[PDB]
Structure formats: structure tokens, C-alpha cells
Design an enzyme around this catalytic site. Structure first.
Site, PDB file in Angstrom:
ATOM      1  N   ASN B  26       1.616  -2.967  -3.109  1.00 39.27           N
ATOM      2  CA  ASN B  26       1.411  -4.363  -2.792  1.00 39.27           C
ATOM      3  C   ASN B  26       0.076  -4.816  -3.330  1.00 39.27           C
ATOM      4  OD1 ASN B  26       0.471  -6.792  -1.233  1.00 39.27           O
ATOM      5  ND2 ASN B  26       2.524  -6.580  -0.355  1.00 39.27           N
ATOM      6  N   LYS B  60      -5.033 -11.781  -2.668  1.00 38.17           N
ATOM      7  CA  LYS B  60      -4.131 -12.173  -1.582  1.00 38.17           C
ATOM      8  C   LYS B  60      -4.628 -13.479  -0.968  1.00 38.17           C
ATOM      9  CE  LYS B  60      -1.058 -11.025  -1.059  1.00 38.17           C
ATOM     10  NZ  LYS B  60      -0.882 -10.955  -2.538  1.00 38.17           N
ATOM     11  N   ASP B 238       2.486  -6.665   7.562  1.00 42.05           N
ATOM     12  CA  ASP B 238       3.549  -7.570   7.259  1.00 42.05           C
ATOM     13  C   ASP B 238       3.388  -8.204   5.928  1.00 42.05           C
ATOM     14  OD1 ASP B 238       5.585  -7.372   9.117  1.00 42.05           O
ATOM     15  OD2 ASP B 238       4.673  -8.814  10.508  1.00 42.05           O
TER      16      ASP B 238
HETATM   17  O1  LIG Z   1       6.185  -8.321  -1.402  1.00 45.84           O
HETATM   18  C1  LIG Z   1       6.151  -8.697  -2.628  1.00 45.84           C
HETATM   19  O2  LIG Z   1       7.228  -8.830  -3.244  1.00 45.84           O
HETATM   20  C2  LIG Z   1       4.852  -9.016  -3.355  1.00 45.84           C
HETATM   21  O3  LIG Z   1       3.750  -8.094  -2.870  1.00 45.84           O
HETATM   22  C3  LIG Z   1       5.084  -8.743  -4.893  1.00 45.84           C
HETATM   23  C4  LIG Z   1       3.912  -9.335  -5.673  1.00 45.84           C
HETATM   24  O4  LIG Z   1       4.236  -9.068  -7.072  1.00 45.84           O
HETATM   25  C5  LIG Z   1       3.801 -10.839  -5.421  1.00 45.84           C
HETATM   26  O5  LIG Z   1       5.012 -11.522  -5.847  1.00 45.84           O
HETATM   27  C6  LIG Z   1       3.491 -11.071  -3.869  1.00 45.84           C
HETATM   28  C7  LIG Z   1       3.457 -12.629  -3.328  1.00 45.84           C
HETATM   29  O6  LIG Z   1       4.172 -13.725  -2.658  1.00 45.84           O
HETATM   30  C8  LIG Z   1       2.349 -13.176  -4.328  1.00 45.84           C
HETATM   31  O7  LIG Z   1       1.487 -14.143  -3.556  1.00 45.84           O
HETATM   32  P1  LIG Z   1       2.092 -15.380  -2.481  1.00 45.84           P
HETATM   33  O8  LIG Z   1       3.624 -15.890  -3.044  1.00 45.84           O
HETATM   34  O9  LIG Z   1       1.145 -16.771  -2.461  1.00 45.84           O
HETATM   35  O10 LIG Z   1       2.176 -14.710  -0.946  1.00 45.84           O
HETATM   36  O11 LIG Z   1       4.538 -10.442  -2.992  1.00 45.84           O
END
Ligand SMILES: O=C(O)[C@@]1(O)C[C@@H](O)[C@@H](O)[C@@H]([C@H](O)COP(=O)(O)O)O1
Ligand SMILES: O=C(O)[C@@]1(O)C[C@@H](O)[C@@H](O)[C@@H]([C@H](O)COP(=O)(O)O)O1
Ligand SMILES: O=C(O)[C@@]1(O)C[C@@H](O)[C@@H](O)[C@@H]([C@H](O)COP(=O)(O)O)O1
Ligand SMILES: O=C(O)[C@@]1(O)C[C@@H](O)[C@@H](O)[C@@H]([C@H](O)COP(=O)(O)O)O1
Lengths: 272, 272, 272, 272
Positions: B26, B60, B238
Site C-alpha cells: 500500500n 496518502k 483500513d
Molecule cells: O487499496 C488500493 O487499491 C490502493 O492502495 C492502490 C493505490 O495504487 C492507490 O490507487 C490507492 C488510492 O485511492 C490512491 O489515493 P486516494 O484515491 O485519494 O485514497 O489505493
């Protein structure tokens, strides 16, 4: 159990107080139009006795095609709000998209707004939290009402504790929205009873605006968010769905009648 | 009807070609861990004969509380990818959040990625479109498969025509996701047949990872996106739900058996 | 953890055993057609090595307009099954609607069936429970997989303990179905691991039949329920969506390849 | 555009007329209780000025376990309605389950009712169509509002043209209901503007009954369907959720205030 009050100037937004109206237009097409729109609301609100906070976007980041109308811009948009404030003496609410924009607008406006797609954007939140200005958190269509606690939380920490929650419906299968009239109470509870408002025009991606706004109001709310255009037909596109200016008043009569009647009911407990 | 091919170096991603694996972790907790993770995939892929593109987040933005782990940072994250590239000779895919970040990462990595919450962010798209690098558009949970045309479009215009679409399920009532196995074909069609991949771990917000990945694979796909952790239990939090490193291989055996069998079927037409 | 086995004659239905096929036609239009349909399945099953239980309705209670084709009738429908049993030596599965019909059919057929709309009909259940014959409980589209315990329960009490559960998708907004590939494991668990089968044609109210049936199979199931018609086009109406007879074999090859490969995998635990 | 009127004796049910109340109890536990329930509504309705049609089930076919309370029975249930009619002079509405039951009840009662699970049961419909008595078609949770035309149709053909449509919410993911306040107008339209009523207690499978009933009423409806029990707590089980008898009046005050205010608004057109 008293409601939390978030004031916007001489305005007191709260779930048991009479409903405020955060009406306006979608984008800031031109001032010749903004002013005309902002002219009718004020006239109508003032005449009907309803608080009011003009609303308009000076930007648009989810448009299709790069070769499209972004919008006035932050630097040329804020200028437009200035003239309206003076000419009309009403508050302005507008949305931001990037962390930096936050402070600039905070000066120019009264109620800033956090977009749904960015509701969970910690950086932009913390930076909107700095301003200390009033916030309006649009409830994403993909998030449940009882999860609005985290957003309000993340904002308290950022030092900001003046927040309003706006609901614009929930996903119902593919390409569709339904408004869970039960989400409002769930949102009041987990929100230290912050003010809840219903974005009716965005919950309808029609001649439906009214029936749906009636239902929202009868639940008893802090506010009502809406948008209108002089000529919805020809200027129809997509995103939300604007109300017809000429029907503002007769439609707002419907709301006050409801909001007033309901806001003054002997607390009921069907609980037991 | 041939499939569009989007290559990532010596890698050819396409719906009829054998499936690529965009596995990883992640976030980039630490290199001592990244390396250990990236060590097992490579070993396993290499041994089983499956293309592979390590994946990890150096950032993140949707975390709860400002007082939380943002992540390594763009400036210290890219440094980590460097060392892995050399030590292991594999491609790196990572997501960006702000318009500016786009180019920096494009240099450092092979496949950049567009977050769902930001899928409809024109500015960040145009700026990701500039780079010209390969893109992975995560399909928002609140958008229907047949709407993925607009995103791919907005990218062609930006000059970028090397795009992959990733599916991570659709909203099913409050706080829940279901994967519409039928969405993949709808996405291939409206996408000039671009490559479609299934983000199984994010479609499961369990001992379910496998059955669900089998189903996805049997449909026939370009890729499979996943995440694992040495110890899912204690480090559970989570967001998504990671796979147990020690089960990588026996689980990937399941996929190849499927992907291979299926990818080599005499085209069928239940149409007539 | 072994699977419950529900035998239909020399047939053993179970989640880990190779998949049975409960194929057939929708209604019993005429024997000249029934026989032709039942002729091709048998030929194809027999040649490919797949268990099989012809299926057909001798009745239709949800048709629009009273002035419509009810169907052959219970008294004239059972007669049709007789001739097929002899001429072909295959089992027949058919649905009932009223409490009384239960026993009559039980004699004539091997696997009776409980309609979804009537899944929660205690009287018709108890009366179907009497027969003691094998049962197929179609999982209503408005009921969650983990609620299939009650139905199986109510049947044990009625003395009947030979039950199969059939899934035909779940409501996804207005006028739409999605198949939650995760529902099968939830259904096996709460069902004392009874046999689970996928009604693919009814989960699609197209050239989609295949991709969707592949996904179901890859999960690993006890059976596959389907329907076909010589000429789907001209005889198209509504309710389900039938497969094209001439594509039976090449489509069933897809299933066995899957069902066989999957049914023989070293039990995996992505749990830990 | 005038509304269709379906009279039940001296009662005129219609979408623009003041709302009728089809209140009552769930099942007919005992007359000592029925009478007590039916005593308070009458007293309250009569005193507040609201039409009323006592409601109660003399049967229950979806109960769990055969070893459970079916209910009084058709033969002993009708007897109970007799005594109430005399003692109180109010109309009785009750549901039927089998084709035969239709006529018996038609004599004894004023408004018969068609269960949702059986909404699409042609035989039971035609047989309920014979009676010629008033009908109440509960809108299944798995059917879209714009599909209520077929049911009303199938009833006209059966010679019956006195129908009311009742809404009790729509499926929202697993084990959950949401009421689409927009479904009422869609139902009025495709129904030759037949009378639409809101079954609030069944749309809530709480202290929610009120807020949700307010919202329904504000839309403007023909009726309101509800259920209450002297002691909801101890006698709580499942199915619906009853209102607390002692809160009937103060809750019905809320409705009339709404229904009256709304039912007398100058027709509005947000359409243009
Ligand atoms: O649990 C996931 O699928 C993941 O770890 C994969 C990452 O490559 C990325 O897509 C991430 C996610 O949503 C990226 O940031 P956010 O859409 O603003 O929360 O989730
Ligand atoms: O139709 C709307 O409700 C509106 O006009 C109201 C604006 O105040 C703003 O919330 C806008 C919207 O979503 C802001 O930007 P985005 O969430 O990234 O598309 O939608
Ligand atoms: O399209 C179907 O799957 C089918 O043809 C299969 C039949 O075995 C039976 O389940 C039928 C159906 O629903 C039975 O009757 P109803 O549930 O009251 O409409 O649908
Ligand atoms: O909770 C209810 O709304 C109620 O008590 C009202 C009754 O008039 C009747 O509609 C009943 C129900 O569904 C009738 O029987 P079933 O549809 O086969 O469970 O539910």
C-alpha cells in the site's frame, strides 16, 4: 439537546432555527448575469423573510475536455464577489479546489466550501482548516451519513469548528441518485449536531425540484442549497439542474410554509 | 477486433495478451520493508512467468487526522524507487495527487496512476497528460463502466494515449462494494478497447481475495492489481485489505491457470 | 470441512464435486420443441461428460395480461415430462406455485423448485417439505446471501433436508441486477454447506452470458442453471434471456475447462 | 390534470383530496387487543378530522418456522372484523394470499390488499379482480415506480378499476430500504393518476417514523399506511416496526398540518 450554531456574520445557521438559503448560480458566467441572478434572490428573500447567502463557482475542475470553460479564475472571480457585496450587501459562498486557494477566498468570502470529490483530501482540509472561516462539507454520494463524523473531526483538529454539512443524495445503482431522508438525522447526531443542509439541485443531477425540496424541508433542516438560471432550457448542459428564476418566489413560499410549520412543532418521540 | 496495446517498457499490456501483475504494497512504510515485499513478488513472478510492475504509494491524502502518517513524501519517495529499480530491475507504478507532482514522478517511474477521487480532475489530468507517460485510471466506485470514455478522451486530447483502466468495484448501498463482472466488457468497448485491470484488494475495502480474483480472471483481463503485507493481522487498519505475502505464489498459480486457460479460448458468440 | 451432498438419483450435487447442469428451456411451449431442446443438451452433455437435469416450466403466473399464455398446465405438463424421461432417460426439474401442486409433480419429477417471489411462502414450503423430494430454492433478488439459512431451516423442520440454493443476482438500483460473486461463499457457509448453483440466464434479465458464467464457475460451484432457445431473436420477449442452442457445446466447453481446473485446486487460505 | 378517485364507501381516496389514513395493527393477535387498538385510532381520527380505514392481518405466510403463529385464520379472522364494524362503524382493510380467499373477504371487508411478494401473481390478481372490490397494491421493494402500470393494467382487464398503490421503499444494498420520494410522482403518472399511499412503517423494516412520514406527506399523497402497538418494546419482533399507540395523536397532528398545508398550494411548475 440543543443544536450547534454556526454563524455567518449576522446569520445564525442551526437545525432548529429557521432555514437559511444558500441559493445562487452554478458558475460565474459573467457579472451581467451574476448580478441579475443575485438581484432576484435578494429581492425575493428580503421580501419573504428568509436568510440568504448567494453562491457561485469561479472555477470548474471536472469539466469534459481541456478545451472548455474552466471559469473566471480565482484572481478574476474574487473581484466579482467584491462588487456584489457592495451593490447588494449579502454573503458569498464559493468552493475551492487547491490547498493554496483557501486563504485568498476566505478574505473575499463568508462561507467557503469543500467539494465532495475532495471531501477526503486531508491537505486541502487542513489548509481550509487554517483559514478558520466557515466551511460547507458537501457529503459525497459514495459515503454513508454516519461517516460525516471524521470530516468534522479532521476539521476541529485543524482548529476549525464552524462547519455545515450538505447532502446531495446517494448512489442508487448506475448513474442515479436517491435522497435518503433518514440521512439528515444520522448526520446531525454524529456531527455534534452541526447544521445540516439539503442540496436539492445536485441531488437531481426537472419539475421534481419542488416535491423533493418539500420532503427535505418537512424533515426539518438548517438550510437549503439551490441553483437557478434565467433560461434553463437553452443553457441546459449537465452537472446539476437549475431552477427557473421566475419561479423562485412561489417555490420559496412552499419552503417557508414548511420550514416554519415544522420548525415549530412540539418535539415528538416515536421512540417509545 | 484486436485489443489496444499499452506498453510499459518491454511490457505489453493488452486484453488478449497474458495478464500483467501490478502487485505491491500500500504505502512506502520503510525500504527495509518495501525491498522485502518487492523481493518476494519478483522472485515469485520470475519463477512463475508473469509480467510484473511493483506498486507503492509515497503519499496518502485521505488519512484520518492531520496528526497521522502522510507518507515518505514525493522528494524522499522517488529516492526509494531508484534503489529498487537498480537492485531488482522491475517497473514501478505509483499514484500522484497534485498537478505539479506529475512530471517529477514520470522520470522516476514507468506507470503513473490517477486516483479515483481525482478521476474527474481536469487540471491534474491535463498535467498528467503532459508527461506522456503511461496512465492507470482507477474507476471511481460512484461511476458507471460506460462513462470511462470521457476520461480516456480527456487524456487523448492532452496528447496522452497510453492508458489503462482499473476497476475496484461499485457502491452497493451504504458502506459496501460489489464488483460487476459485466463492467469489464463495457469498459473495453467504450475505451477503444484499452487494457482493463481488476483491483481486487481495493474492491474488498479476507479469505475472499481468491474467489473474487478467480472470477475476475475468468472474464479475461489485461491485468490484476493487488497488495500484500508480511503480517496483515497486526498491521491491519483500513483502506484496502492486503494479501498475505506467504500466499503470493499459491494464489498466483490460481491466476495463471485461469488467465492462461481463458486467454486461449476460441472466441465465442452467445450473441446469436 | 466437507460439502453437503444432495443426490438426484444417480446424480450427486455438491460444491466440491464436478458441476451439474440444470439446463433447459423456459416454458413448455410444445413437445415438438421441448424434445428438440432436450435432445441437444443430452447429446452435448453426454458427449462432454457433464451431469444434467433438463428443466422447463409447465406454468407461468407472472405474465402480463390475463389474456396470455399461462402454459400447458399441471395436468398436461406432467404428461410431457413422462415422454421425455422414457425417450431420453434424464431427470426433470420444474417449478411449482400452489401448495397442492407439490405432490403431483414430486411423483413425475426428480428436482422440484421453489420460485423466488414465493421463497418466503411458509405454506407452500411446508407442503413442498412434505413431498420429501429434492428442492431448489431460487435466491430472491431482494434478499441477502446470509439470509438463506432461514429457508433451509424452515425446510429441515418440514422434514426435508435435500436442498439446493440458486442465485440469480441482486438488485442494483432500478430495473437492474448485479451478481455478487461473494454471495456464493456466504451462502455455502450459512447453509450447512448445501449445494450452490448460479442461474446465469436469470441474472441477466446477451453476448454476456459467457463472461458472466465463466466468473461464476471460477468461484467453484455445485451447479449451473441456464436456458436456451433455437431462435432467441424472433422469439425474444422478456423475463430471462436464453442462450442460442447452436452455441451450447462450445459454451459448455468453457465451463468444464473452468469447473474442472478450479474444482481441483489445493485449498487456499488468503485468510492468514 | 385531475386525480383519479377510488371511493371506499363514503370515503373518497385521491391524490389531491385530503389524506386518508389506513392505520391499524400488524396481525390480529386477539380481539381484546384489536378492539383496544381500533378504539384509539377512531377516537383520534374522529377527533382530529381524518378519514380512516382500520387495517389488520388475519394471516401470515412469511413467518419463520412452521411451528409459529400463522394467525387467526380466514374463517375466524373475518368474524373479528364483523364485531368491529358494528361496534365502531369504520372500514376494514386486510390482505389475502390465495386466489380463493378473495371473495370471502370482499364481503366482509371494504378494501382488500395485494401483498408485494405476490404483486406479480396473475392468478391471484385475476381472482382479486373478480371481486370488483377496492384494491391496494403494495409496491414490491424490487420493482421500480414506473412499472406499476402493468399491475394496474392487469387489474383493469380483470374488470377491476378501483386501485390504490402503496409504496414501502426500495432495496438499497443488502438488508436495507430507502424511500425514493420521487417515486410517488412517477407512480401517479403511469397509474392514470391513481391514488398513491406511503407505508411508512414497512419502509422502516424507530424514532424515525415521524421525520420519514413528514417527508412523504410534504410530497402530497392520497394516503398514509401505518401500524402501532401498545407496547412496541416487549412485543418487538420483526417484519415492520409499529408506532407507539400513545403517540398516535401528536404524530397525526404533524401529518394533517402538512397534508393540509401542502394539499392547498397553488400548483407549481419548476418544469419551466
Ligand atoms: O487499496 C488500493 O487499491 C490502493 O492502495 C492502490 C493505490 O495504487 C492507490 O490507487 C490507492 C488510492 O485511492 C490512491 O489515493 P486516494 O484515491 O485519494 O485514497 O489505493
Ligand atoms: O450542482 C451543484 O450543487 C454545485 O454547482 C454547487 C457548488 O456549490 C459546488 O458544490 C459544485 C461541485 O461538485 C464543486 O466541484 P466538484 O465536486 O469537483 O464537481 O456543484
Ligand atoms: O429465467 C429463469 O431463470 C426461469 O425461467 C427458471 C425457472 O426454473 C423458474 O425459476 C422461473 C421463475 O421466476 C419461476 O416463476 P416466478 O419466480 O413467480 O416468475 O424463471
Ligand atoms: O408491515 C406491513 O406493512 C404489513 O404488516 C402491512 C400489511 O397490510 C401487509 O401489507 C403485510 C405484508 O407483506 C403482507 O404479507 P407478505 O407481503 O407475504 O409478508 O405487511
Amino acid at each position: 439537546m440543543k443544536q450547534k450554531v454556526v454563524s455567518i456574520g449576522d446569520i445564525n445557521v442551526a437545525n432548529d432555527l429557521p432555514f437559511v438559503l444558500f441559493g445562487g448560480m452554478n458558475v460565474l458566467e459573467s457579472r451581467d448575469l451574476a448580478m441579475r441572478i443575485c438581484e432576484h434572490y435578494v429581492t425575493v428573500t428580503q421580501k419573504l423573510g428568509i436568510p440568504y447567502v448567494f453562491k457561485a463557482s469561479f472555477d470548474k475542475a471536472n469539466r469534459s475536455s481541456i478545451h472548455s470553460y474552466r471559469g473566471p479564475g480565482l484572481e478574476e472571480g474574487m473581484k466579482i464577489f467584491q462588487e456584489l457585496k457592495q451593490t447588494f450587501g449579502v454573503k458569498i459562498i464559493t468552493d475551492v479546489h487547491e490547498p493554496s486557494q483557501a486563504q485568498p477566498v476566505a478574505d473575499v468570502v463568508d462561507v467557503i466550501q469543500l467539494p465532495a470529490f475532495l471531501a477526503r483530501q486531508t491537505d486541502l482540509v487542513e489548509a481550509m482548516a487554517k483559514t478558520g472561516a466557515v466551511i460547507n462539507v458537501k457529503k459525497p454520494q459514495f459515503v454513508s451519513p454516519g461517516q460525516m463524523g471524521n470530516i468534522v473531526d479532521k476539521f476541529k483538529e485543524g482548529g476549525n469548528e464552524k462547519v455545515i454539512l450538505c447532502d446531495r443524495g446517494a448512489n442508487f445503482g448506475y448513474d442515479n441518485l436517491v435522497v435518503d431522508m433518514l440521512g439528515f438525522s444520522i448526520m446531525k447526531k454524529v456531527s455534534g449536531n452541526s447544521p445540516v443542509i439539503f442540496d436539492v439541485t445536485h441531488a437531481l443531477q426537472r419539475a421534481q425540484v419542488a416535491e423533493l425540496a418539500r420532503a427535505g424541508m418537512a424533515v426539518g433542516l438548517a438550510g437549503l442549497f439551490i441553483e437557478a438560471h434565467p433560461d434553463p432550457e437553452h443553457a441546459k448542459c449537465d452537472g446539476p439542474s437549475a431552477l427557473p428564476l421566475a419561479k423562485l418566489e412561489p417555490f420559496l413560499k412552499q419552503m417557508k410554509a414548511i420550514d416554519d410549520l415544522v420548525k415549530g412543532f412540539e418535539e415528538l418521540d416515536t421512540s417509545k
